Amino acid sequence: SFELLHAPATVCGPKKSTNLVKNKCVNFNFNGLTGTGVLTESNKKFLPFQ
Amino acid sequence: TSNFRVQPTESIVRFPNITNLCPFGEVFNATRFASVYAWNRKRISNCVAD
Amino acid sequence: VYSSANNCTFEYVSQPFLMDLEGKQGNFKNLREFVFKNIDGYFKIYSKHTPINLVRDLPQGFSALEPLVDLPIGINITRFQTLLSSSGY
Numbered sequence: 001s002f003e004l005l006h007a008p009a010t011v012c013g014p015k016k017s018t019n020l021v022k023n024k025c026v027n028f029n030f031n032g033l034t035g036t037g038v039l040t041e042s043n044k045k046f047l048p049f050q
Numbered sequence: 051t052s053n054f055r056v057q058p059t060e061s062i063v064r065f066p067n068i069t070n071l072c073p074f075g076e077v078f079n080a081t082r083f084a085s086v087y088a089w090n091r092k093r094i095s096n097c098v099a100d
Numbered sequence: 101v102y103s104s105a106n107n108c109t110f111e112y113v114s115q116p117f118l119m120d121l122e123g124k125q126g127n128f129k130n131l132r133e134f135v136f137k138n139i140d141g142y143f144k145i146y147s148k149h150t151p152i153n154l155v156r157d158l159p160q161g162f163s164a165l166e167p168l169v170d171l172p173i174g175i176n177i178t179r180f181q182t183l184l185s186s187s188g189y
């Protein structure tokens with residue numbers, strides 16, 4: 001029995017992932033963040049929660 | 051006369067992982083099924099339901 | 101007096117929030133700042149944990165608190181209680 005109310009969902013299906021393609025123009029979705037462009041290795045240092 | 055744009059080829063979809071996978075053993079594998087007079091209820095939350 | 105909920109909506113277990121102990125044998129007491137927020141369906145906690153030499157009032161220095169947890173708990177938070185010579189909070 002499934003319900004939808006207003007509270008954030010806590011039960012969900014698996015989120016299928018693909019491999020990672022670098023140095024090419026691609027479409028992407030990183031944990032819900034979408035866009036297009038070319039991915040390269042960064043020299044930026046993100047904090048553990050960013 | 052016109053503009054050009056490099057088009058994307060592949061697509062990248064990436065999610066953290068599959069964790070807290072919902073067992074469902076408590077309802078499909080458990081041997082001690084209750085009868086209709088006292089059917090059991092198991093609550094599912096904070097999990098991945100495949 | 102009582103010790104039974106007979107329920108469970110959500111449960112989370114991780115590393116202790118308060119028990120970060122270092123810099124003993126000195127005046128460096130660990131000031132443990134927390135920020136608690138209740139937003140649409142989520143309860144957020146931020147914290148830092150910074151040792152200070154002056155223990156009487158806030159140090160008047162500057163730092164930002166980092167995200168600690170973010171729990172999908174859709175409940176009514178209107179009141180709260182702190183559970184605990186006597187520096188207090």
Ligand SMILES: CC(=O)N[C@@H]1[C@@H](O)[C@H](O)[C@@H](CO)O[C@H]1O
Binds near residue numbers: 075078
């Ligand atoms: C209710 C239940 O879990 N039944 C499991 C099934 O899911 C699993 O795939 C199989 C081994 O392949 O063994 C059965 O006992």
Ligand SMILES: CC(=O)N[C@@H]1[C@@H](O)[C@H](O)[C@@H](CO)O[C@H]1O
Binds near residue numbers: 106107108
């Ligand atoms: C013993 C007890 O209080 N059980 C309560 C039930 O009365 C309430 O209707 C339900 C709402 O989800 O939550 C249960 O934990």
Ligand SMILES: *[C@@H]1O[C@H](CO)[C@@H](O)[C@H](O)[C@H]1NC(C)=O
Binds near residue numbers: 176178
């Ligand atoms: C409980 O929350 C609802 C909306 O979420 C609000 O209208 C109601 O006043 C709250 N109850 C109390 C005691 O504050």
